Each structure stands twice: as C-alpha cells, then as structure tokens.
C-alpha cells in the first residue's frame, strides 16, 4: 500500500524539468527524488553527528 500516493506529478503551470535522482543517506538506503541537474546519484555526507573525540578519531582513520 506504499505505492498509493506515489504516482503523481507537479500540478503547477510554470516549473523546471525534474529528474528521478537516487539519493542515498548516511545509512545505506536510497530514495528517488525529483530534482534538476540530472545527476544519476546523490550522497548525503556527515561531519557534525559526533563530538570532538570521535571527529579526531575519524580524521586519524582517514
């Protein structure tokens, strides 16, 4: 039943062309987003979730 309100378009008159880009968050899961600049994939980064000690540990690991 998750596909109930999925098949819709922009009901406005003036709008730019949108493309079904694939956005992947910091979890390993992907979603479809209507977005301009038709890049095939977008990635959500993160540099603020953890504190200073974990940030320094990640910097050392990188």
């Amino acid at each position: 039943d998750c596909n109930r309100a999925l098949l819709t378009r922009l009901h406005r008159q003036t709008y730019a062309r949108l493309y079904p880009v694939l956005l992947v968050k910091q979890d390993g899961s992907t979603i479809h987003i209507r977005y301009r600049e038709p890049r095939r994939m977008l990635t959500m980064p993160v540099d603020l979730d953890s504190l200073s000690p974990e940030e320094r540990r990640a910097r050392f690991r990188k």
């Binding site: 039943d1 998750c2 596909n3 999925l6 098949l7 819709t8 378009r9 922009l10 008159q13 003036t14 709008y15 730019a16 062309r17 949108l18 493309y19 694939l22 992947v24 390993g28 899961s29 992907t30 301009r36 600049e37 038709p38 890049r39 095939r40 994939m41």
Partner: protein, 228 residues
C-alpha cells in the same frame, strides 16, 4: 462463573523496502513522467546543453572563443562521468530472502511486507502455535502487562511503539470462561540476543500466518490485521 483474563501482543515490523509496481502502475508512472516533461518549461542543464550545441555549430563556421572552460562541463563529458560514477557505485541487495530460502525466523526476512512474531509453546494439555499472550493480576493494566510481556518473554532489548491504549481484538472461549485481548504494537528497533535459542520464534507475513495458525480463535487475527 469464574473468568480468566489474558492479554496478548501483535508486533508488526515496518516494511523496509517499497513494494514493486503493478504493470498498470508502471504505465501510469511513464505517462505521468511524459506529461510532466511535456508541460515543463526547461531545465538549466538542458538549456545549457542546447546552447552549447548551437554555439559549437556556429563556431565551426565562425572560429571565435565564446566559452573556453565550459565546453564539455555541461552534459557530454560531465554526463558520462555521472553515468560512470553511478555504474561504479553498487546498491544493496533488495532480495535478502530469495538467497536464503531457509530461515523463516530472521527479522530481516521480508522487507516489502509487514511481519508478526509467532512463538511455539507446548503446554501439558495443549500444543499450540500461539501468539504471544500474557497473564496479569487485576491490579495491573492491559497495556502495562503487554509491555512487561514484550520486555520479559522476548528476552531481548526491543523498542515497541504502542498505537493506542484501547484493545485491538477480543476473543472468548468457555470451558468457567476465559478471554484474550490482543493489542497491536509496532516495532521500532529490536536487538534480538541469542538468535540460536530453542524458543521457536518466527517472523511471518499474512499468507504464511494463515498457513500456520490452525485454531479458529487465532484464525480471526487477519480480521483486524492489515492485509496491505
């Protein structure tokens, strides 16, 4: 007339992946995409691509530097690099059950549908594939009893979100009578420890649920269970 009272819990796991589309829905989605593209005015990428395509054709007869850095940075090489990155990146496997086909007890069994938990118990006089029930003294609430049951019997750290305080289903059987009140709960995050235990706990969908549950009392759970 003596009366026995029991609660019971129906735990639903949210579907992780979206269900596949019916071919009619695919045709409708294609039509919607086509009409949206038709009614759209223009995108910046397409406008720049057509402008560069016309500018190259004009420059092939009039050799003059109109744009130096931005020649292939719009589509062309940039689009090819986008496609290359998309192909190089690999997504997760949505079919985590077809490869296994063995474990019906895994929490990661089905991702498109919702699953419920069934526990096997063999009593002295009954051998019942029973939904997780409870027992409570009249000084306790049904919802608190369900919370205690999910905290104790499940033997794991699990976060269950209760929808409403009101009961979801009621079923009676008289030998002296007894009543069982089924409450629906939603799984948020469960860390099931000791997955190799002898306690037969199975995550099961609607069809296999109808296949498993024999008695008439548990055969009417689908009356209030969402078919999806």
């Amino acid at each position: 007339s003596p009366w026995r009272l029991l609660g019971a819990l129906c735990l639903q796991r949210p579907p992780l992946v979206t269900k596949p589309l019916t071919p009619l829905q695919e045709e409708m989605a294609d039509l919607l995409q086509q009409i949206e593209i038709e009614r759209s005015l223009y995108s910046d990428h397409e406008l720049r691509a057509l402008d560069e395509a016309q500018q190259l054709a004009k420059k092939k007869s009039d050799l003059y530097e109109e744009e130096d850095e931005q020649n292939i940075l719009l589509a062309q090489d940039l689009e090819d690099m986008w496609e290359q990155k998309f192909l190089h990146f690999k997504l997760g496997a949505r079919l985590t059950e077809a490869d296994k086909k063995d474990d019906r007890t895994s929490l990661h069994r089905k991702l498109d549908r919702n699953l419920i938990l069934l526990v096997r118990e063999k009593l002295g006089d009954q051998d019942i594939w029973m939904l997780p029930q409870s027992d409570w003294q009249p000084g306790e609430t049904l919802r608190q009893t369900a919370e205690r049951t999910l905290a104790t019997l499940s033997e794991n750290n699990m976060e269950a979100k209760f929808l409403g305080n009101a009961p979801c289903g009621h079923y009676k059987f008289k030998f002296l009578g007894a009543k069982v009140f089924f409450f629906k709960a939603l799984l948020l995050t469960g860390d099931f420890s000791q997955a190799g235990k002898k306690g037969h706990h199975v995550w099961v969908s609607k069809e296999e649920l109808g296949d498993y549950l024999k008695p008439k009392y548990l055969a009417q759970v689908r009356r209030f269970l969402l078919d999806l």
